[PDB]
Design an enzyme around this catalytic site. Structure first.
Site, PDB file in Angstrom:
ATOM      1  N   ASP D 145       0.868  -1.163   0.000  1.00 16.43           N
ATOM      2  CA  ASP D 145       0.000   0.000   0.000  1.00 16.43           C
ATOM      3  C   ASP D 145       0.918   1.230   0.000  1.00 16.43           C
ATOM      4  OD1 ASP D 145      -1.810   2.057   0.900  1.00 16.43           O
ATOM      5  OD2 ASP D 145      -3.354   0.485   1.596  1.00 16.43           O
ATOM      6  N   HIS D 218      -9.389  -1.785  -8.315  1.00 10.56           N
ATOM      7  CA  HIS D 218      -9.129  -0.567  -7.560  1.00 10.56           C
ATOM      8  C   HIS D 218      -8.155   0.336  -8.314  1.00 10.56           C
ATOM      9  CE1 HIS D 218      -8.796   2.089  -4.212  1.00 10.56           C
ATOM     10  NE2 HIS D 218      -7.501   1.788  -3.982  1.00 10.56           N
TER      11      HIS D 218
HETATM   12  O     O Z   1      -5.108   3.814  -1.524  1.00 14.35           O
END
Ligand code: O
Ligand code: HEM
Ligand code: HEM
Ligand code: HEM
Ligand code: HEM
Ligand code: MG
Ligand code: MG
Ligand code: O
Ligand code: O
Ligand code: O
Ligand code: O
Ligand code: O
Lengths: 306, 306, 306, 305, 306, 305
Positions: D145, D218
């Protein structure tokens, strides 16, 4: 109590494995070097303390033992036994001396290897040299965490060091080495779930698969062996990735230490010959052994006094 | 600024140097890879932040430039020029692409090299692959500290990055590579004082020899160059030891970056062809170049926009 | 022969304390988890070695012991004894299992807690969960260094591990936990000299107050106990700060290990019920206990063999 | 003008503190804003250089109008609720944000303690999350991330207000959302299926190629280009948090951008979908329980109050 | 730009301060050393990168300047001005050259000092040598955090480096040094609250006392100065504890850098002579100055070009 | 069972050596300090764990022993014996107490020394105070790696700690100190090969010279001793550079620990008085001893009572 070599090393992220044969007439040069190898380890390592963690474990093969020494042989010392399985083969390759050099940095390994081989020039012939590196999460070339179930502390000492069963050689150990090359293209074609079924543990989290899902031909299932008393027979491993991207060489250098070679040999028989329940260890469908040697690593006192 | 590649890296203790040629018909695959190389650097490196310090500098050769790209050429890009000295020779060897991969650990370098070469399989042929490691006190294989007089900060930026003199290529640099093998037996036969006379600096303390004792054919004397302006002409080096103990290969992988290859080439002419007061650089009496290539390392934005 | 749990841990900067009760019918699930908890510690922790320093100490309460096992009980195992002092009260709160998870980083603690609770959901009900952190230079929320007079080395082993007095349970320990919340506003209204009189040591330098000036109702005076034989009775503590700024919770999670609970209980009696010279420990005028439980932490081999 | 430390080095601990300003608390708040940089130095200096303590302070739209008079940042408004066909992005109260980061939680906690000590009686806490880095920059879904965050000058250009709103140059806009994950559902997917949700490989963090990356992944939905062809970027510093006993496993999302339009476009694509994608698949495993927008002024704006 | 010396150093925990005078006839030897001091810094420091953080700032006094150089003088260079206050005195002591050597370890500082003084033997007379060490939480000998309100980044460059106001000497700075000895017995007789009133900040937490409670004769109050322009006048300090326990010497070596000496001199006037509301800085009731000197630290290129 | 002082310390890069004499009437103050010295070590050092590595070894001299204690004396405790060699002299200088303070940083050493001397003010007179620093690659002032052949682990315990041969004092050790000053100008005039012949090891790589090239008057040759049984007699050393550039003092502070002083004294006799093959240790042609003292360092339990 007799002082072992540094078989039980801290975790190290670099290694050099050096396997040589002793040339005719080279015995005396080799013997002088054996009696100095601990002092060379200190000379190269001391100034990089405490984080260098340089050690050298020196091993001697069966045929070499008879050339170098008279008197008693370690009880378990014999040449590596070829296994000709129905599908997979564990080859036996020549090797008189092993130097297993480990540190937190490759340069210390290299510096000590340079000093050792400098003393042996003209007395030995190199058979194998591997420069190993750990991946940053203790992973191997197949992407799995490698070393998790090794024994530690007292259980490690009991699994790896010769004791009262062969008292002249107490504090020694037996090392088996095999260099493996992997078929990475084939391995990467498996889903993660299929890879987990080969190894027997979860890939990301390193949790062992439960007994009701772990296949009998997984690597963990075949290398789990129990002795007469119901207790686990254990070895100590320090497998190291190596390779060359231009030559498409992606490898694991296997090294396992044990108090008696019988434990390691039982595991290898199960892997390569199979059992009633398992044709062979599925890891071998993605891994080819190209070397195989067995060595005795004596106690440090034995090397000094000779 | 345009954004340069990571030519000015922090100190890193591991490197992979990969040199490949582009096969006939491989140009499209190579162009796709060039546009993705920065995202592969992040994919491998980000998760190892902040300690990993992984970077990849990508360089393109003169003949490869012509095959890959439509328009204008960097002004200084040409094939490496062979130097045929009275005693020593600097050879030119093939190389279309250079990947100069650096990090604080070899595994990250290897992981990025694997991903790059995975994408280039079938389009390129490997010419050279070197796995370099720094010795623990920034020493090279001759035992001398290596890097001391490199420029730093703004002086480095000004010496290495193309600016307004070639504005379409601002933020690029020129890399010269040569793989050297050393004659360690010969070198170790010299006294320390004689070795210091070859290099031009003290061995243990790395203090430069004074002007009245430094020989004219020392390495430091011949690679010190002043421009028309009276000012020092500088390059940025990140030389890496490499080798193999069994083969008796002890090497220095030379890489020098500069804003124009003329600076680097002047130094090489002085080393190989000599001057009025020096036949050649004495370091070459213990060092043989076995490769030689020149590459342009474009700004990062140039590669992204393909 | 018996291997203790990691009661004597190196200094760690993060902890999770998890206290649960076992639901009706959950005993079998709990027993399976106990036999695997060491495996889970390795699965989570091995890949972060050697820096991670992850360990889990598992403790079992008095009433839980009788539900889970039959046969012998550890000699000292009983429910925590409430102390109803004239002013201050040490409450007893429910707790069947303790997981004392420590590491050099919180993520490892959390990952192991997640795996443990994943196996136990449906069998247990959480009663308390605290995420502790090291606060500056081993300070607690009152601003004093916390841990200074802990025993170390041999003296720690002798103070903490059950031996020949209860040989079936040798290598175990007894843990007492109490969660304390502090009245920081009141505490910060004292001068430093007044705070030093509460604790019994200097605040900035952590030097113990001399016998002449140390008050009898200081924390250090009341928790110093000598046994019949003249020797100091010691425990091992690993108190952790915790809190929440928005709720104004500033806490110390107390945990103390000892080879018999009588030592810890004597200290608690002195603190809460006082002596001839001291009504109660002055630290309690700024610290309220909101939990209290006692657990036996068996030897590691006891858990493995289930 | 000197920005706050929006572009921080990587930090492994954070505290996110969201409060509302009580009736009559405005003057106390203004005094604290003028001292917050001093408190950051007092708590942090003694742990330099490894501590890397910083505090970014943000102010919400309704709060701005209570605290200050005159001109307002051009893009400052309350977070916009998104009522999608399946998923909803809720708006929750928040007047002040303290985004506190460091290499250790204790530094964060010490600075939060000093800030809240000064504000006692003037503010009401709405949200407090203690975040921790999880392994090798992974989040609670097990993916790396942060990988495609901008860096260096590209980051400065994406996050700092400039000539388009010159009175507020050097500020930024922060959007926060606290997400909880349904881990049981997520762990029921194969790794390959999880990779299709995110759009990158799980273990190696290599982006899926354009011919296999789904349109509702995403990465696909949060990739946006502007009219002129260039990538519209934000800077994120998402932090895991949770509680094992309550089965709470979360990602605290924070995204900075020079205008809230960029962030809001990404959110619309995620929640309301596009021509080719009903919504971001990550939302089938992720529920937003807070949502707030803040303006983070230049450091000199706060000093001069 | 011109290249400044490393006035703005990272935090370093060791220092050597060397002050010398130039003997009769010593000027040529000194000039040779000045032109080499940057290369000595690299020789000693490079091989200890990146942790060593070794630097040397070289400064030249007013009288020395005229002996060494002709042409222009820096506008602000003059001998340190004695301040003969009603109670406290700031003394002037001789010094022609200052070497401010900093690193993460004392040995590196010593190694560089050895090389510098080796080159100057016979040309200079030592006046002061101080080996400084920082306490582990950036505290000084009085127990307070020392450094907190130093400027950083752009604000530091603007406060410390000469610019367009004296363009021939742009990139230089002015250093004032004073060696202080403390009366530790007296200081330790104060309560912490009283000590906080002398400094102007909290001892444990380093939070500044509010304007309403900070006394006018506190150190922080008197060394806070605003210019005619409304803005704060800043200096950069790197104060270092030193001492000898056997001689009962406990000291602070003050060094402050500024773009003009007038800033530093104004602070000293306020400390020693007082203001309308304050007789003198209360820190001086526990601290005695025993040296005092002023130096100009030129840009690095000025020294290189001699 | 008896707990030794921290004689076997990890590698430490800073030290303070403090040697004092006990003034007339100061015995009681000294005894009180001895019973507290381990708690001062913890007070200063605990909060700096784990990097600080602070320890203090306390030693007591032969004449001081008789003033402080009655009853049994350690069997090997006597005053340092002066050696008057044909060329070089090992002097004996006064010293009743030794504090050997080590850490990873000099400030911790100083903080503990300050607390110790604070308690002893008025009872003792300082004789020597040295602030030592190791070079970054474990080198000494002569430029050689220093410490290489020290024993480790069980071999160190067996070489250094008193055992069954003197059971009342088991867990103690004997420390010999000498402060040496070096003639650096003369030393730097030697070639590296000549320096290696003085020490007995290679300078850059720290490899021992082979038996057939190592001179008999090298330092390593003369300090290698075998006992009656043919086994090596070992000591544990922690030599520290020190100095002052202004005064041209460049020094090595020698400290050696052993289970009996006989081993250390035999090495000293060989160095200063020579053997059949060697007039004296060549290192002494560049090194002058200006102090010499012998101390017994009791087990930690002995001091606690
Ligand atoms: O993100
Ligand atoms: C290509 C070669 C190999 C690879 C890549 C490999 C990899 C692994 C991995 C990933 C694990 C699981 C984690 C752990 O280390 O506990 C493992 C376990 C193990 N491997 Fe291997 N291995 C290889 C060869 C061998 C060989 C040749 C042997 C034995 C002769 C062996 C013996 C073991 C044992 C004993 C375990 C532990 C099983 C248990 O008790 O759980 N390995 N190996
Ligand atoms: C065998 C190959 C080489 C070795 C082992 C080597 C080693 C060294 C060493 C030990 C130094 C002194 C310390 C330092 O400043 O880095 C140095 C300096 C230098 N080398 Fe090399 N070098 C090699 C090849 C080259 C080549 C091929 C070039 C130029 C084309 C070169 C350019 C330089 C320069 C510019 C310096 C610094 C000179 C100065 O002090 O200004 N080197 N090198
Ligand atoms: C509010 C809860 C507590 C706080 C903040 C606290 C804090 C401290 C502090 C600051 C010290 C001094 C330094 C050191 O650790 O040696 C200390 C010592 C000690 N505490 Fe506590 N403590 C707490 C509760 C307790 C409890 C409940 C016990 C035992 C039942 C206890 C037993 C001890 C002992 C044995 C010592 C060492 C005494 C000695 O010097 O020999 N503490 N504690
Ligand atoms: C005068 C300053 C001294 C210096 C600079 C010095 C330096 C050294 C060095 C560089 C070595 C080799 C590396 C090592 O193993 O540590 C060494 C070894 C040694 N030194 Fe010293 N030394 C000094 C004084 C002494 C004294 C006074 C003694 C004994 C009374 C002594 C006993 C030893 C011993 C036993 C060894 C180990 C020899 C072996 O078995 O290899 N040294 N010393
Ligand atoms: Mg339930
Ligand atoms: Mg669920
Ligand atoms: O393995
Ligand atoms: O070089
Ligand atoms: O405690
Ligand atoms: O200061
Ligand atoms: O030594």
């Amino acid at each position: 109590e007799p002082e072992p070599q540094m078989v039980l090393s801290p975790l190290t992220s670099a290694a050099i494995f050096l396997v040589v044969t002793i040339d005719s007439g080279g015995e005396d040069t080799v013997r002088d070097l054996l009696s100095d190898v601990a002092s060379l380890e200190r000379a190269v390592g001391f100034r990089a303390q405490p984080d260098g963690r340089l050690s050298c474990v020196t091993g001697i093969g069966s045929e070499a033992w008879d050339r170098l020494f008279s008197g008693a042989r370690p009880a378990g010392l014999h040449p590596f036994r070829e296994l000709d399985g129905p599908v997979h083969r564990a080859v036996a390759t020549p090797g008189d001396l092993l130097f297993h050099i480990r540190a937190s940095r490759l340069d210390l390994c290299f510096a000590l290897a340079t000093e050792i081989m400098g003393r042996l020039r003209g007395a030995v012939t190199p058979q194998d040299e591997v420069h190993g590196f750990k991946y940053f999460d203790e992973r191997d070339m197949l992407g799995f965490v490698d070393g998790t179930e090794n024994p530690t502390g007292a259980a490690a000492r009991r699994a790896v060091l010769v004791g009262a069963e062969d008292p002249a050689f107490a504090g020694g150990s037996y090392a088996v080495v095999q260099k493996y090359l992997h078929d990475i293209d084939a391995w990467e074609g498996l889903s993660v779930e299929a890879q987990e079924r080969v190894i027997g543990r979860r890939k990301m989290t390193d949790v062992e698969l439960s007994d009701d899902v772990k296949p009998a031909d997984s690597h963990v299932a075949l290398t789990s062996v129990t002795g007469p008393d119901g207790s686990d027979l254990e070895i100590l491993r320090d497998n190291m990735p190596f390779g060359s991207v231009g030559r498409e060489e992606f490898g694991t250098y296997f090294i396992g230490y044990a108090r008696t070679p019988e434990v390691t040999e039982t595991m290898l028989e199960r892997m390569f010959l199979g059992t009633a329940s398992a044709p062979h260890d599925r890891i071998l469908d993605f891994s080819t052994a190209v070397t195989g040697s067995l060595f005795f690593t004596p106690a440090a006192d034995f090397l000094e006094d000779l």
